[PDB]
Symmetry: D3
Subunit: 144 residues, 6 copies
């Protein structure tokens, strides 16, 4: 199974700091499934304000992590890259079960559902230590 480090990811994702929210993608099975890795550390800029004295990872950035891992494997598979950026179209059945904190390691399990005509839709679940922490169905399109 394929894997991508951060420098490789940068070839398929246009996202940069402070908005590149996966560190690795592993167990990449073509197009259909992968698992994205995101280390959560206190030394991230969002923790300055979310929340002061009580750092907790904003759910929306988890969603964004998920979306980036999905979009990443699709850009890899479809011979696309950055220079052709994604555009988030829908999020459904997004459910947050447990807060995540500095020190936690997020694994974003994404499963295909659909990817055709510059438009993919994945089923994604976020785990921290085989505990499901969030889930959503995320759809985006891509432009050129």
């Amino acid at each position: 199974l394929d894997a991508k480090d951060i420098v490789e990811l940068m070839r398929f994702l246009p996202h940069r700091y402070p908005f590149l929210l996966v560190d690795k993608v592993v167990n990449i099975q073509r197009d259909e499934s992968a698992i994205g890795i995101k280390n959560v550390t206190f030394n991230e800029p969002h923790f300055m304000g979310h929340f002061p004295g009580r750092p907790v990872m904003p759910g929306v950035l988890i969603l964004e992590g998920m979306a980036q891992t999905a979009g990443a494997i699709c850009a890899i598979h479809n011979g696309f890259d950055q220079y052709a950026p994604p555009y988030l179209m829908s999020i459904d059945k997004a459910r947050f079960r447990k807060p995540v904190f500095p020190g936690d390691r997020l694994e974003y399990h994404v499963n295909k559902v659909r990817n055709r005509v510059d438009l993919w839709k994945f089923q994604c679940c976020a785990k921290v230590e085989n505990t499901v922490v969030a889930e959503a169905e995320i759809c985006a399109m891509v432009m050129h």
Copy 2:
């Protein structure tokens, strides 16, 4: 109808820079409805990486804007404040119709649906110049 400037907001929202994503809240009708204001400007940190030479507002921060205006009127109404922080639980039927850019002014129209037992759920739609730019149903606890 009630309004809150940024300094007042800061009393009900624990959120600070870089994650305080509403600038005002206006036409606050108790608990049931409001409209949050967010000016989009190029001089915001996320525009460094989203995207380089092509700044466009991340939809998730639109969601977060909506969630903040909701939670803010709920914190105001229920005699709560910060020190009792919110926790986003669900987002459903989230739909992004049109990209927003520096210079745009977002208005987050939120409408009650539910708020009881430290648990509210609102129906929210984001507009730029009477054009609906996004919509979601957001639910959080406190």
Copy 3:
């Protein structure tokens, strides 16, 4: 009348984050007049320190806003761009009448006075909702 969005602006202004202080320029009449747009939002880096718990837009950044809108229309008109960067030379009669806050929208009305030999000088006034909030006469070279 011409207008420029942020991405276009970037071709005429070398300024980048955190010091690109206009979001749009509109009603561009050649070289002679324009109006620069700057949305003020809490999510800007300078509000971390100006001031803590009391965000208020620094007057010098309003100045810098005005200077950029002027220098932009001049760079556009004279077939210049970035790669040829401006150098602020003078500011006179600068007067700040009212504080501006998150949620506010600044319009920088600039009027020609002079532009020849890589050296322009404009009369600029900043408004927030047809209320004059500042004014200055600014001169720079290139």
Copy 4:
């Protein structure tokens, strides 16, 4: 002659990062004159965008440097502090003669002219190695 380090300054200036633009104030003669110290280093946030690959100190921040040194000695002298924040009102005869860069050390010589009824006006000149690099007359209220 009196001096203030950064931690002392913080008691008289409400300004914080990224907008606290003097590091020291020395040769403080009551109320009438001082000299503000500002080290220019590449590791400052504004150099990210002013300019990319060509760091050069923004003139308006030099202005702001001067204003802060003035407002500081006034806050010290008049038994004021932060909690009573300044408001910049005018800038006149502002003239920038030479660009300043990382590695440079700015000295802001300020001279009284006026300070009464929460309203001072100073004559300020900025030097880098006994070379005048800018000058302005600045007035603010409190």
Copy 5:
């Protein structure tokens, strides 16, 4: 064995963003040993410039991580906290063996050597997946 989460750590370390470089401390045996946890993620501010397009963790921040975990257990043990800040005095035998990257998880193993009269000196080794990535002997003093 004791452990401290980030909010607890904040009581014993005065360090804040962008210079709080441990996320957790675990297996805290009094004063004598612990292991500090630091997740390395791309979304940290230093990665903007170290290096552009090639994020690699600066060794000096690893040293700093180590020093913070040592100083943390000492502040805990000695009934100290922040408000009494540390002051780094020496670093010796600092050796960096392998680069660390976004996605990596740092464990800082620290062992006592000395702690008396507001002055401690620890032996510290940084591992990523039971692989020694760095080591140093770090001494600091504390003031009140």
Copy 6:
């Protein structure tokens, strides 16, 4: 004797904000010795958290300053540049004698010891006003 300003430095050091920790390098004698300049100012990001209301320069960034001035003269001498990045391997006999603050000007005196096969090791001492403030022996590869 050779000198490099910040823009030149940028050609030999891959490091950028917020981790470019020298502003100049002067008295560059080939490869063998130099002196790096770093102005310490309050307006640097690390001073946000090191420490709040008590800014004091982190010793490790002093080390990093020294390492950068070393690696910079080595990159200059050996016809290298950035695109071939350095990797810090050892630090020994590192000793911090006196805290440095905003307003201070650091000078990093570095002296060769060794530089062969993409592997240099220098003896470095940091001074503020002819007072030795720190010292280390630093070794890196490329």
